Structure 1
């Protein structure tokens, strides 16, 4: 066998993790979403004004509900028993780059329209692959979203990006009967966030992918 060691980016992502759930107890909850009301909304706009990705539409909605539920847009400090509830919203996006999993951020997401946020993730991801991305662009994720759906998968239990307080898992689309379905999940620090309040969050969010007309 060939023993192989640890890298830079690999040593980072190793470390982020060994710590993330060294000190954040993970709770994870899910619902499903009648995404048919969603799915077509991109297809009509993928018709005129490419693009809006699935990643891209979600990041559009997610902030305005973290607005109602503040406990989820927050950070975990080393002053120990402490807080940082961030009022501004820069959301993280986990992408696969040939070296290892890289998180980056959408500058004030609660400001950007559908297309912009989607043109940006396009801008940064292929730039994230060619490993030419900059110090400021990977920093200050108040919250973060992980899509596996462009590969596959029903539902996962993702590990929260430290030191945020919450992460959200996008997955593959379904087709139950005869509507378009998809499972979403939520993982969080089960101390700064209850059971109930994590779930109360996903339903208010679900309701705006349920009703994009709201």
Structure 2
């Protein structure tokens, strides 16, 4: 790849050199390797979470009696796990021969935690078998160990899919980079009240912006629109997971 020409930045004013943590450099290398290896498309969608939000907030009591804080992430994890089982091409990697897909029969999902030293993505194993408060506890633990440098490399491995949630900071949508060898990543942004047509008038519904980046060698455009559509459907009524 043609390199970027060096510039003497000090010709234009005062500069200062700060160094990169090894964690940032590892991260830098991994993203650029994904970038050049995966042809990326982002599919955007927004889900109606008015009812999900009401549930979240009502179970604040239960969650606190169990010591966890029920946020939107355990709900996101549960729903993507159900869906990764319904649409198995999202739960696979491209074989090194380029001629086969390795479909995984397990569902472990990573989630982005941004710490001082860099971004870490802890992995929760067998998300499909854990409950909303179990996933809530685990997420919280892994996030804390990630911030406190106590996260052993074991827990950063063998994920099938990544969720990256920035809803707690802001933004309308973003285009995340697929953490290869996984084949998709779900970006989640800030929810806001939007007017939604009820067939007769605009009702305010709470809308969650979803941004699915995927590896289009493996997942074609229609399979991906169907994944964010099913996800939007499941988050609008999470009871559909029960059937």
With the shorter chain as reference, the TM-score category is over 0.9
Identify the residue that residue 30 of structure 1 maps to in structure 2.
Answer: 44
- 5+ residue gaps in structure 2? 1-14, 196-203
Q: What secondary structure is seen at the aligned counterpart in 2 of 1:207?
A: helix
8 Å CA contact 1:170–1:185 kept in 2: the answer is yes
Q: CA deviation at 1:67?
A: 0.9
Q: Which has the higher contact order (CA 8 A, sep 6+)?
A: 1
Where structure 1 has 5 or more consecutive residues not aligned to the other structure, the ranges are none
1:20-99 counterparts in 2 under 5 A? 20-50=34-64, 51-99=69-117
Matched residue SS, 2:48: coil
How many corresponding residue pairs? 214
* 4+ long deviations beyond 4 Å: none
- Which has the greater radius of gyration? 2
Which has more strand, going by share of residues?
2
TM-score (norm 2): 0.84
2:21 and 2:62 map into 1 onto residues whose CA distance is 44
- Conserved 8 A contact 1:77-1:163: no
SS at match of 2:194: coil
Q: CA RMSD in A?
A: 1.3
Using the TM superposition, give the Cα deviation of residue 80 of structure 1 relative to its aligned residue in structure 2, in angstroms: 4.1
Q: Give the deviation of 1:182 after TM superposition.
A: 1.5
Aligned partner of 2:31 in structure 1 is: 17
Deviations 1:165-197 (A, max 9, x none): 000011111011422111101100011000000
Please give the residue correspondences for 1:163-182 in structure 2 after superposition, counting only pairs within 5 Å: 163-177=181-195, 178-182=204-208
3-state DSSP class of the match of 2:102?
A: coil
Which is worse superposed, 120-129 or 2-11? 2-11
The correspondence for 2:157, drawn from 139, 142, 157, is 139
User: CA distance change for structure 1 residues 66 and 17 in 2, over 3 Å: closer, same or farther?
Assistant: same
Contact 2:21 2:117 in 1 (8 A): no
Matched residues in 2 for 1:180 and 1:56: separation?
A: 18
